Amino acid sequence: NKNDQDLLLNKSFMNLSEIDPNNDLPKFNVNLLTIDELVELHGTYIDSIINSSLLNEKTNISYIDQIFNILQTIFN
Amino acid sequence: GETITLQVGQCGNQVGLQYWQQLATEHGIQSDGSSTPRNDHPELFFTLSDSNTYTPRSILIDMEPSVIAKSTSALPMFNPRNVHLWINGYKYGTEEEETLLNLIDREVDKCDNLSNFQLFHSVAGGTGSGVGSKMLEVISDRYGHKKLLNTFSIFPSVQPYNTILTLKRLIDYSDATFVFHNDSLNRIENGANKLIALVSASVSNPLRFPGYMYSSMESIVSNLIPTPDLKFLTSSIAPFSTQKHNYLNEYDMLLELSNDRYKTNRVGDTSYISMLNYLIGDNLDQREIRKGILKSQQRISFVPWVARSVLVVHGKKSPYLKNTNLEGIQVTNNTSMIDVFTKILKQFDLLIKRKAYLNRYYSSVEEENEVMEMFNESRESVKSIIDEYKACKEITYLDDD
Amino acid sequence: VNQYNVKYSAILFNNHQGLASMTTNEMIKLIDSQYNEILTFLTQIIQGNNKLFTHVYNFKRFYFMETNDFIDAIMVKGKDV
Amino acid sequence: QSKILNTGKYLNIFKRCTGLHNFESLKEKLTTITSLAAPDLELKIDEFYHRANKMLMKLLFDGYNFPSVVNIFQRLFLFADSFQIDNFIDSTFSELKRG
């Protein structure tokens, strides 16, 4: 569940006897995501890995450069 | 932090069985370790598996398998891996030192942040008292003094020799030792393990059922042990509960908890070194407790050099106990220890001048010298603690004159 | 899409006379019903017939090196190419 | 003035929270102020204010579960359950005492 502040409110304090559109509409065990939501979800998932703490571009040198230097040592 | 319970001897095992039954009842844990439908924290005393089973942290040590078999069969959720099977017993404990050291290190590794060691044993237990006396030494040696030890030693009702030999190590290594007498327990009842189990279970109530204060054993003990020499505690329990004519107010609980007849050890005039009262009820009226604290402070005779403070913890009753009326436990540090220690020393001297049963311990010349020096050291240590408790009473305790 | 078009045209043009001939409360309710139905079907396709999670898992399996045996096979076979 | 302002604000809070555009779903019978010179203007304002309080109170208590929010604030701020904060202090004892 993507618990949020709007999911917190239990609306059943209102009577709300009726249900819509119909019982024929399934409940699907997965969060209903918009198209833009799916694009953003996969983009954030990839970005987190590629821009991790070790893999970021931030001795004024990045961790990736040091790792690659060690790899060149092993190649030699 | 988590606590580890050590059970030694037949009396220790029976008391531990009652204690764990009480604790499991309070936390709703079934006999098989399954939960029953959290705000309480049984993790401090039970190990929780990722299959939702609770098993006690206790370690069972005994010379014979009958007692351990009864205890394990009564409570199936004991882990069998933790089961292990006077001078002769202590020398036997030396042989099994490696196995026991590894066995305890397993429990210490299993917990996340160890706090203290609980020990249930009987001073008058003979061989089991010897193995427990060795247990204290090995634990104190390996884990240093960062982790404190609490011993719920049961005092005795040839025995004098055993009591002195066990009390030497009890004084040396224990950090906070409760004193229980079978005489006062059966006097109160007018079976007996159900009182000791109840007192021990209630002593840690603020840890398992957290409230505003007293969240750690350090806070509970430090209020009662001003000096490491004075480490023996006297516990008092109010028996009049669950009857129709119960104490009508917590204020009357505070006033009538101080009666000398309810104390769990033989007592005349005594001076209190420290106080701490347990009140355990769903709802507690504050103003009654304030009035009771004021009266208790004005009535009780404290030693001159102590701050003269009475502390009342507001324990919370377990949800699994249905709407039962108020109950309370009192733990004190008195100067009455001199009487019981003097009694033990008198018996020891009477039976040491007469070489009655020393043949069972003195095997040769070197054994004679060894036992003589050991006995002399134990006697001197007991006299030292008696003199310290006697010097606490007088007013010149802090003076260098 | 055609079935949906017929179903909701039978509400906009038969039950009512268009969006203009609709009070704001009923118009909001209609849009909410359409939104729920549309996203329900979008899920039933994308994470249903398409199996989005399975293909994301396979992306992680192959791109992020998880099936090391396959890559070892590639490297041993292509060690000369 | 205070009653009018607070009645309107409370109804606005209800609408913005539960998402209703208007109170049609409740199907309640309401009476409007017929004129400024009417004698029951104060009574009508009082009734409307009581209705607004009734709705907002039930929203907060039944719907948003305010009673449990009070216990949560008690625990987190005033340590009505001191176990967690005790663990926190124990874990970072060396750091907290430093400058």
XYZ file of C-alpha atoms in Angstrom:
657
model
C 0.000 0.000 0.000
C 1.209 3.487 -0.875
C -0.144 4.819 2.419
C -0.915 8.533 2.144
C -2.683 11.261 4.133
C -5.809 10.900 1.977
C -5.956 7.133 2.534
C -5.884 7.882 6.271
C -9.418 9.311 6.235
C -12.083 6.647 6.847
C -15.044 8.076 4.927
C -17.466 5.483 6.319
C -18.431 7.926 9.070
C -20.709 9.124 6.297
C -23.586 6.710 5.734
C -22.566 5.903 2.125
C -24.812 2.865 1.733
C -24.368 2.986 -2.059
C -21.463 1.574 -4.082
C -20.430 2.531 -7.615
C -19.993 1.915 -10.487
C -20.865 -1.743 -9.863
C -19.677 -4.923 -8.182
C -18.529 -6.054 -11.647
C -15.411 -3.851 -11.447
C -12.517 -5.925 -10.021
C -10.213 -5.083 -7.141
C -6.778 -5.912 -8.434
C -4.178 -6.524 -5.684
C -1.978 -3.794 -7.235
C -2.018 -0.017 -6.926
C -3.838 1.621 -9.833
C -1.144 3.717 -11.527
C -1.544 6.356 -14.220
C 0.560 6.292 -17.383
C 2.720 9.175 -16.173
C 2.920 7.420 -12.809
C 4.315 4.265 -14.429
C 6.876 6.277 -16.387
C 7.935 8.157 -13.245
C 8.073 4.953 -11.188
C 10.437 3.197 -13.566
C 12.486 6.362 -14.044
C 13.010 6.771 -10.310
C 13.852 3.087 -9.925
C 16.587 3.338 -12.564
C 17.832 6.714 -11.317
C 18.283 5.436 -7.771
C 20.649 2.705 -8.967
C 22.622 4.764 -11.467
C 22.956 7.768 -9.115
C 23.727 5.794 -5.956
C 26.228 7.017 -3.377
C 29.111 5.046 -4.893
C 28.132 5.576 -8.544
C 27.640 9.348 -8.352
C 30.016 11.786 -10.039
C 30.597 13.710 -6.791
C 40.922 14.389 -3.089
C 38.499 16.160 -5.453
C 37.975 12.840 -7.266
C 34.972 10.539 -7.452
C 34.733 6.980 -6.169
C 34.180 5.677 -9.704
C 37.546 7.028 -10.851
C 39.357 5.302 -7.978
C 37.572 2.021 -8.687
C 38.470 2.254 -12.373
C 42.092 2.960 -11.443
C 42.170 -0.237 -9.381
C 40.614 -2.091 -12.322
C 43.385 -0.786 -14.583
C 45.881 -2.059 -12.016
C 44.337 -5.529 -12.269
C 44.423 -5.375 -16.077
C 48.131 -4.539 -15.978
C 18.178 -4.183 27.473
C 17.664 -7.941 27.434
C 18.108 -10.166 30.489
C 19.359 -13.747 30.840
C 17.991 -16.052 33.544
C 20.129 -18.778 35.120
C 18.468 -21.598 37.064
C 20.636 -23.780 39.311
C 19.593 -26.695 41.498
C 16.283 -28.379 42.239
C 14.851 -25.482 44.254
C 16.065 -23.056 41.614
C 14.450 -25.082 38.838
C 11.096 -25.305 40.624
C 11.099 -21.579 41.400
C 12.062 -20.887 37.797
C 9.204 -23.025 36.513
C 6.735 -21.036 38.607
C 8.401 -17.778 37.542
C 8.210 -18.570 33.829
C 4.626 -19.790 34.130
C 3.731 -16.474 35.770
C 5.591 -14.451 33.141
C 4.022 -16.357 30.240
C 0.577 -15.911 31.779
C 1.207 -12.173 32.085
C 2.274 -11.890 28.426
C -0.333 -14.338 27.131
C 2.301 -16.680 25.700
C 0.967 -20.223 25.444
C 2.757 -23.314 26.722
C 3.924 -24.136 23.180
C 5.344 -20.638 22.616
C 2.514 -19.402 20.385
C 1.164 -15.884 20.825
C -2.358 -14.918 21.907
C -4.086 -11.753 20.610
C 1.731 -4.859 20.901
C 2.539 -2.343 23.638
C 4.326 -4.728 26.013
C 7.896 -5.914 25.411
C 8.374 -9.632 26.112
C 11.475 -9.531 23.902
C 13.520 -8.548 26.967
C 12.794 -12.006 28.414
C 11.788 -14.126 25.384
C 13.457 -14.800 22.037
C 11.106 -14.194 19.103
C 11.526 -16.325 15.985
C 10.467 -15.343 12.473
C 7.825 -18.072 12.794
C 6.089 -16.321 15.728
C 7.272 -18.459 18.639
C 8.430 -17.246 22.058
C 11.053 -19.236 23.948
C 12.548 -18.318 27.339
C 16.128 -17.087 27.598
C 16.714 -19.149 30.736
C 19.453 -21.759 31.144
C 18.744 -24.891 33.183
C 21.525 -26.443 35.273
C 21.019 -29.418 37.580
C 22.853 -32.494 38.819
C 20.002 -34.903 38.003
C 17.660 -35.188 34.989
C 14.392 -35.739 36.894
C 13.865 -32.083 37.837
C 14.854 -30.817 34.392
C 12.576 -33.395 32.769
C 9.624 -32.264 34.881
C 10.338 -28.607 34.134
C 10.691 -29.157 30.382
C 7.600 -31.372 30.139
C 5.514 -28.841 32.070
C 6.641 -26.040 29.712
C 7.368 -27.508 26.255
C 8.607 -24.172 24.868
C 11.931 -24.503 26.721
C 14.825 -24.976 24.319
C 16.458 -28.363 25.095
C 19.814 -27.070 23.825
C 20.101 -24.898 26.962
C 19.795 -27.853 29.380
C 23.012 -29.054 31.036
C 23.439 -32.051 33.340
C 29.767 -28.732 48.158
C 33.476 -28.808 47.359
C 32.941 -31.882 45.182
C 30.287 -30.024 43.200
C 32.517 -26.964 42.833
C 35.406 -29.113 41.589
C 32.945 -30.746 39.179
C 32.015 -27.265 37.981
C 35.674 -26.598 37.257
C 35.766 -29.611 34.924
C 32.707 -28.425 32.966
C 33.883 -24.799 32.830
C 34.454 -24.779 29.058
C 31.044 -26.219 28.171
C 29.168 -23.828 30.454
C 31.201 -20.837 29.271
C 30.320 -21.600 25.648
C 26.704 -22.311 26.607
C 26.311 -18.879 28.209
C 28.179 -17.182 25.369
C 25.561 -18.616 23.004
C 22.759 -16.787 24.819
C 24.799 -13.588 24.991
C 25.437 -13.740 21.248
C 21.754 -14.445 20.590
C 20.555 -11.243 22.270
C 21.083 -7.773 20.806
C 21.964 -5.662 23.879
C 22.525 -7.525 27.143
C 21.635 -5.748 30.391
C 21.870 -8.105 33.381
C 22.054 -11.735 34.494
C 19.323 -13.147 36.722
C 20.190 -16.170 38.862
C 17.710 -18.428 40.661
C 19.461 -20.707 43.136
C 19.343 -21.943 46.718
C 22.225 -21.262 49.098
C 21.441 -24.457 51.038
C 21.286 -26.574 47.870
C 24.407 -28.645 48.503
C 26.066 -29.681 45.242
C 23.883 -27.425 43.106
C 24.872 -24.513 45.315
C 28.488 -25.361 44.502
C 27.924 -25.369 40.756
C 26.059 -22.054 41.031
C 28.896 -20.608 43.097
C 31.244 -21.569 40.262
C 28.803 -20.083 37.737
C 29.033 -16.690 39.421
C 32.832 -16.774 39.310
C 33.085 -17.726 35.647
C 30.469 -15.198 34.521
C 32.024 -12.349 36.505
C 35.481 -13.211 35.190
C 34.611 -13.465 31.506
C 32.137 -10.581 31.172
C 33.892 -8.176 33.517
C 31.781 -5.745 35.521
C 29.965 -3.902 32.717
C 27.025 -6.325 33.047
C 25.576 -6.639 36.546
C 24.146 -9.785 38.148
C 21.001 -10.263 40.240
C 20.708 -13.351 42.445
C 17.390 -14.395 43.988
C 19.140 -16.588 46.533
C 16.927 -18.653 48.845
C 18.411 -18.795 52.336
C 18.355 -21.847 54.625
C 15.438 -22.303 57.004
C 26.511 -29.734 58.004
C 24.414 -27.000 56.399
C 26.337 -24.115 58.087
C 29.498 -25.001 56.165
C 27.637 -24.941 52.850
C 25.906 -21.657 53.660
C 29.215 -19.974 54.505
C 30.985 -21.328 51.423
C 28.201 -20.125 49.140
C 27.849 -16.765 50.889
C 31.534 -15.974 50.372
C 31.139 -16.034 46.582
C 27.682 -14.459 46.801
C 29.237 -11.464 48.553
C 32.234 -11.327 46.237
C 30.580 -11.491 42.813
C 26.859 -10.665 43.017
C 25.813 -7.073 42.318
C 22.327 -7.080 43.882
C 21.245 -10.097 45.929
C 17.691 -10.628 47.130
C 17.225 -12.525 50.396
C 14.356 -14.986 50.838
C 13.716 -17.209 53.857
C 11.507 -20.282 53.734
C 10.531 -19.533 57.341
C 8.925 -16.191 56.529
C 7.419 -17.530 53.301
C 5.585 -20.357 55.057
C 4.678 -17.937 57.851
C 3.057 -15.668 55.255
C 1.202 -18.597 53.714
C -0.219 -19.379 57.168
C 3.292 -23.582 47.175
C 5.950 -21.389 48.762
C 7.690 -20.954 45.396
C 4.604 -19.007 44.131
C 5.553 -16.067 46.438
C 9.145 -15.912 45.183
C 7.970 -16.184 41.584
C 5.450 -13.384 42.120
C 8.017 -11.079 43.724
C 10.611 -11.709 41.014
C 8.040 -11.235 38.244
C 6.821 -7.956 39.731
C 10.333 -6.605 40.336
C 10.844 -6.218 36.571
C 7.315 -5.004 35.786
C 8.417 -1.484 34.708
C 10.668 -3.066 32.066
C 8.127 -5.388 30.436
C 5.189 -2.934 30.653
C 6.844 0.428 29.982
C 5.587 3.667 31.445
C 6.933 7.170 32.014
C 9.890 6.138 34.159
C 12.140 3.325 35.417
C 12.668 1.919 31.924
C 15.912 0.083 32.810
C 17.245 -2.222 35.511
C 20.056 0.240 36.243
C 17.500 2.780 37.456
C 15.661 0.209 39.574
C 18.763 -1.154 41.299
C 20.763 2.070 41.672
C 18.023 3.458 43.923
C 18.670 0.680 46.466
C 22.453 0.101 46.566
C 24.294 3.231 47.773
C 27.475 1.205 48.387
C 28.612 -2.054 46.741
C 29.157 -3.574 50.194
C 25.490 -3.220 51.210
C 24.047 -5.345 48.411
C 21.423 -7.480 50.199
C 17.771 -6.525 49.743
C 14.707 -7.297 51.857
C 11.463 -7.742 49.925
C 7.963 -7.236 51.330
C 4.712 -8.387 49.716
C 1.143 -7.438 50.580
C -0.812 -10.732 50.703
C -4.335 -9.337 51.194
C -5.545 -9.148 47.614
C -8.211 -10.840 45.494
C -10.288 -11.353 48.644
C -13.468 -9.391 49.307
C -11.837 -7.487 52.224
C -8.891 -6.196 50.054
C -7.062 -2.951 50.743
C -9.603 -0.271 49.918
C -7.079 2.314 48.677
C -3.541 2.416 47.344
C -2.839 4.731 50.281
C -3.625 1.860 52.652
C -1.396 -0.325 50.480
C 1.476 2.098 51.062
C 0.825 2.266 54.803
C 0.300 -1.477 55.346
C 3.096 -2.604 53.016
C 5.601 -1.655 55.738
C 4.347 -4.180 58.308
C 7.188 -6.359 59.555
C 5.048 -9.507 59.385
C 4.832 -9.398 55.574
C 8.607 -9.268 55.060
C 10.137 -12.355 53.462
C 12.870 -12.720 56.097
C 13.019 -12.988 59.869
C 13.371 -9.626 61.620
C 13.429 -6.226 66.074
C 14.143 -2.552 65.439
C 15.540 -1.887 61.961
C 16.830 1.097 59.993
C 15.980 1.453 56.307
C 18.750 2.315 53.857
C 16.613 2.665 50.724
C 13.030 2.175 49.591
C 11.058 1.533 46.425
C 7.387 0.533 46.291
C 5.580 -1.172 43.420
C 1.931 -0.366 42.748
C 0.352 -2.344 39.909
C -3.206 -1.474 38.905
C -5.102 -0.435 35.751
C -5.818 3.024 37.239
C -4.062 4.708 40.160
C -5.271 7.795 42.024
C -2.383 10.250 42.291
C -3.555 12.194 45.348
C -3.847 9.020 47.433
C -0.280 8.139 46.473
C 0.965 11.610 47.425
C -0.662 11.359 50.850
C 0.735 7.860 51.326
C 4.242 8.933 50.334
C 4.145 11.796 52.826
C 2.983 9.522 55.643
C 5.530 6.834 54.745
C 8.364 9.365 54.836
C 7.218 10.698 58.200
C 6.843 7.196 59.687
C 9.910 5.238 58.519
C 13.289 5.428 60.277
C 16.044 6.083 57.730
C 19.767 6.002 58.486
C 21.242 9.489 59.059
C 23.447 9.688 55.953
C 20.844 8.640 53.355
C 18.792 11.166 51.395
C 15.581 9.861 53.013
C 13.544 9.498 49.812
C 10.707 7.048 49.146
C 10.069 6.153 45.501
C 6.768 4.757 44.187
C 6.647 3.283 40.679
C 3.283 3.320 38.902
C 3.269 -0.110 37.311
C 0.725 -1.014 34.647
C -1.332 -4.200 34.874
C -1.163 -6.699 32.029
C -4.025 -6.652 29.487
C -4.137 -10.450 29.741
C -5.226 -10.279 33.405
C -8.898 -9.355 33.545
C -9.708 -6.280 35.620
C -8.144 -7.656 38.804
C -7.923 -5.343 41.806
C -4.760 -3.514 42.852
C -1.688 -5.405 44.047
C 1.715 -4.192 45.179
C 5.268 -5.273 46.037
C 7.787 -3.526 48.295
C 11.567 -3.917 47.989
C 13.738 -2.427 50.729
C 17.339 -2.315 51.929
C 17.426 -2.726 55.713
C 20.043 -3.153 58.412
C 18.202 -6.295 59.535
C 20.731 -8.343 57.550
C 23.013 -8.289 60.592
C 20.664 -10.574 62.531
C 20.504 -13.349 59.929
C 24.223 -13.132 59.156
C 25.000 -13.287 62.874
C 22.782 -16.367 63.157
C 24.644 -18.035 60.292
C 28.026 -17.140 61.800
C 26.999 -18.449 65.225
C 25.939 -21.765 63.707
C 29.153 -21.938 61.680
C 31.371 -21.288 64.708
C 29.434 -23.776 66.839
C 29.843 -26.465 64.181
C 33.451 -25.546 63.279
C 34.809 -25.866 66.805
C 33.303 -29.372 66.822
C 34.839 -31.430 64.002
C 31.504 -33.102 63.326
C 31.392 -33.766 59.570
C 34.635 -32.257 58.228
C 35.912 -35.748 57.381
C 33.697 -35.647 54.278
C 35.733 -32.644 53.054
C 39.241 -33.006 54.548
C 40.914 -35.770 52.529
C 44.592 -35.221 53.411
C 47.019 -32.749 54.981
C 46.981 -30.504 51.914
C 43.191 -30.782 51.780
C 43.012 -29.915 55.481
C 45.085 -26.772 54.952
C 43.115 -25.823 51.829
C 39.740 -26.159 53.534
C 40.992 -24.348 56.637
C 42.239 -21.337 54.679
C 39.084 -21.270 52.537
C 36.854 -21.394 55.617
C 38.873 -18.673 57.338
C 38.560 -16.397 54.309
C 34.801 -16.971 54.105
C 34.355 -16.287 57.823
C 36.421 -13.102 57.603
C 34.415 -11.838 54.623
C 31.124 -12.453 56.425
C 32.415 -10.646 59.512
C 33.530 -7.771 57.289
C 30.057 -7.366 55.816
C 28.481 -7.567 59.279
C 30.804 -4.836 60.540
C 30.049 -2.684 57.492
C 26.232 -3.053 58.005
C 26.736 -2.253 61.765
C 28.842 0.863 60.964
C 26.130 2.036 58.579
C 23.712 2.332 61.511
C 25.762 4.805 63.552
C 26.035 8.522 62.805
C 29.849 8.671 62.464
C 29.812 6.579 59.282
C 31.100 9.414 57.076
C 33.589 10.717 59.657
C 37.302 9.971 59.357
C 37.851 10.015 63.136
C -12.930 1.075 -26.242
C -16.034 0.707 -28.406
C -17.938 -0.999 -25.591
C -16.950 1.830 -23.232
C -17.951 4.429 -25.821
C -21.425 2.931 -26.128
C -21.831 2.526 -22.371
C -21.013 6.130 -21.507
C -22.727 7.643 -24.539
C -25.874 5.955 -23.225
C -25.432 8.117 -20.105
C -24.350 11.417 -21.636
C -26.844 11.507 -24.528
C -29.694 9.164 -23.509
C -30.003 9.508 -19.727
C -29.117 13.212 -20.023
C -28.914 15.702 -22.902
C -25.165 16.354 -22.816
C -22.610 17.808 -20.456
C -24.413 21.159 -20.416
C -27.616 19.492 -19.171
C -25.885 18.091 -16.096
C -25.574 19.532 -12.610
C -22.038 19.882 -11.300
C -22.499 17.129 -8.706
C -23.596 14.560 -11.290
C -20.914 15.689 -13.749
C -18.192 15.174 -11.136
C -19.646 11.782 -10.238
C -19.674 10.725 -13.895
C -16.058 11.767 -14.389
C -15.049 9.889 -11.234
C -16.753 6.718 -12.458
C -15.047 7.012 -15.842
C -11.670 7.546 -14.173
C -11.986 4.465 -11.971
C -13.154 2.284 -14.866
C -10.416 3.479 -17.216
C -7.579 2.958 -14.757
C -8.974 -0.443 -13.776
C -8.825 -1.562 -17.400
C -5.400 0.024 -17.922
C -4.082 -2.040 -15.019
C -5.825 -5.174 -16.296
C -3.925 -4.760 -19.565
C -0.500 -3.427 -18.595
C 0.056 -5.543 -15.476
C -2.228 -8.259 -16.858
C -1.743 -9.392 -20.444
C 1.552 -7.507 -20.753
C 2.911 -8.731 -17.379
C 4.815 -5.563 -16.547
C 6.339 -6.927 -13.343
C 7.685 -10.059 -15.036
C 9.417 -8.040 -17.746
C 10.863 -5.589 -15.224
C 12.185 -8.598 -13.314
C 13.745 -9.934 -16.520
C 15.297 -6.517 -17.177
C 16.908 -6.697 -13.750
C 17.888 -10.331 -14.346
C 19.768 -9.684 -17.594
C 20.924 -6.054 -17.545
C 22.017 -6.132 -13.882
C 24.097 -9.289 -14.412
C 21.992 -11.513 -12.145
C 22.162 -14.672 -14.282
C 25.931 -14.919 -14.020
C 25.949 -18.372 -15.634
C 24.672 -17.009 -18.952
C 27.335 -14.303 -19.031
C 30.065 -16.770 -18.103
C 28.867 -18.907 -21.013
C 28.993 -15.906 -23.353
C 32.505 -14.970 -22.255
C 33.891 -18.508 -22.451
C 32.311 -19.071 -25.868
C 33.275 -15.656 -27.249
C 36.736 -15.504 -25.698
C 38.235 -15.431 -29.214
C 35.622 -13.363 -31.064
C -19.345 37.891 13.583
C -17.253 35.092 15.063
C -20.077 32.574 14.666
C -20.624 33.466 11.008
C -16.928 33.354 10.142
C -16.330 30.070 11.966
C -19.424 28.374 10.521
C -18.280 29.178 7.008
C -14.701 28.131 7.681
C -15.770 24.830 9.237
C -17.982 23.921 6.287
C -15.127 24.842 3.937
C -12.755 22.573 5.877
C -15.235 19.705 5.661
C -15.702 20.111 1.911
C -11.976 20.379 1.217
C -11.180 17.377 3.424
C -13.796 14.806 2.417
C -13.822 16.036 -1.190
C -17.560 16.701 -1.447
C -18.512 19.444 -3.885
C -21.751 20.055 -1.967
C -23.799 18.398 0.769
C -26.272 16.618 -1.495
C -25.338 13.125 -0.310
C -26.491 13.909 3.235
C -29.961 14.874 1.868
C -30.705 17.070 4.945
C -33.602 19.617 4.991
C -32.334 23.189 5.419
C -34.030 26.549 5.960
C -32.506 29.720 4.520
C -32.515 33.216 6.006
C -35.615 34.863 4.568
C -34.595 38.468 5.259
C -32.166 40.673 7.151
C -35.071 42.178 9.114
C -36.333 38.778 10.280
C -36.499 38.252 14.064
C -34.886 34.780 14.094
C -31.566 35.765 12.505
C -29.653 34.950 15.692
C -31.460 31.619 16.042
C -30.721 30.719 12.419
C -27.045 31.602 12.832
C -26.853 29.525 16.012
C -28.471 26.540 14.294
C -26.115 26.764 11.315
C -23.104 27.051 13.620
C -24.235 23.992 15.572
C -24.674 22.045 12.331
C -21.169 22.990 11.203
C -19.687 21.980 14.556
C -21.602 18.698 14.474
C -20.206 17.800 11.057
C -16.624 18.896 11.744
C -16.571 17.199 15.162
C -17.765 13.918 13.732
C -15.247 14.208 10.896
C -12.343 14.729 13.293
C -13.329 12.093 15.842
C -15.005 9.291 13.888
C -13.328 9.774 10.452
C -9.806 11.216 11.140
C -9.457 9.302 14.512
C -8.339 12.314 16.634
C -8.571 10.428 19.978
C -5.755 8.135 18.859
C -3.766 11.126 17.603
C -3.830 12.454 21.167
C -2.268 9.258 22.531
C 0.296 9.263 19.720
C 1.322 12.819 20.596
C 1.508 11.866 24.275
C 3.818 8.948 23.513
C 6.117 10.705 21.057
C 6.495 14.015 22.916
C 5.989 13.312 26.637
C 7.364 9.739 26.706
C 4.222 8.004 27.970
C 6.148 4.943 26.738
C 9.806 5.514 27.591
C 11.279 2.267 26.228
C 12.138 3.581 22.756
C 13.677 6.860 23.922
C 15.657 4.922 26.521
C 17.091 2.748 23.753
C 17.859 5.881 21.744
C 19.780 7.507 24.597
C 21.620 4.259 25.328
C 22.651 3.855 21.686
C 23.985 7.417 21.291
C 25.149 8.183 24.824
C 28.696 9.040 23.743
C 27.529 11.452 21.034
C 24.807 13.346 22.888
C 27.143 14.514 25.665
C 29.657 16.030 23.214
C 29.638 19.701 22.292
